[PDB]
């Protein structure tokens, strides 16, 4: 247990000045290799988080299923060093969405791109989709992470209308109120911080350990919460629907949000 990469990885990344990234929330590791004639990523995720979404092992999976399919890392390096799942990757090509925007008028064009996303996911065939995301497999992954003590029960930042007042009574609604559900490529993380942008058009998607199957809903509900917080204008909202050509299911847009408020 030398707590984190293997020697191979270590000369990989010496020509690199290695910059730790400090917007991820996960409890993933993430550090920026600021190259010469490029950037290279690293990813890692310990042991206690094997088998879960978290897992980069499983993130690295997606990563190389989605290629030829949608704007995705290359795989450049992975391993299972120490009991950590470590992945080495290049940049993403583009502009970070949170980044390209961070301060402007352009309500349209985050909107637009978040429907871009939706229906570009649709456009992907999952008949041969590595793994399976439905609530079920959820819900006993949440279990088993407030079993292990593995997820954030106290500070984390909340919706301002989730209702419940502690974990277990949202997994008991999340688990009484599952909606039907109809299977389509879902990203599993849906945010500004996610997603790569250029020329006003998507160009990259990164953060794919929770990608795979799962009910269109709960993307769009992704979408619609960075929206509704991010660009206060219930027209905003409205505006996206007419761009994905269809009427919000608010019982399954408040269901998916809820479901991600303790991962
Ligand atoms: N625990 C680790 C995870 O932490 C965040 O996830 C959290 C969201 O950030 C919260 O939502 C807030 O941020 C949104 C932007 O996404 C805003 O729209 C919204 N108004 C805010 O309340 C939501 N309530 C809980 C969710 N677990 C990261 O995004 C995710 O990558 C990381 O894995
Ligand atoms: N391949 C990549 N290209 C560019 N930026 C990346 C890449 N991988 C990660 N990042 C950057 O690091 C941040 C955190 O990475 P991410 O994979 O989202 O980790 P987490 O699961 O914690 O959100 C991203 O918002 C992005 O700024
Ligand atoms: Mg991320
Ligand atoms: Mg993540």
Redesign the pocket.
Known sequence: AKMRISPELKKLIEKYRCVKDTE???PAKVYKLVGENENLYLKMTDSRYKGTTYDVEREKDMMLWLEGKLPVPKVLHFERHDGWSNLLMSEADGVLCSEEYEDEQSPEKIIELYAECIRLFHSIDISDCPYTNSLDSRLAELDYLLNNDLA?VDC????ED?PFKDPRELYDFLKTEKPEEELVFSHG?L?D??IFVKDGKVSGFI?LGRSGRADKWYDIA?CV??I???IGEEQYVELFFDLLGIKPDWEKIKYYILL????
């Open positions: 991820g929330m996960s954030d984390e930042n909340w919706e989730t993380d945010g911080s996610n953060d992704f919460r960075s509704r917080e991010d991600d408020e303790l991962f």
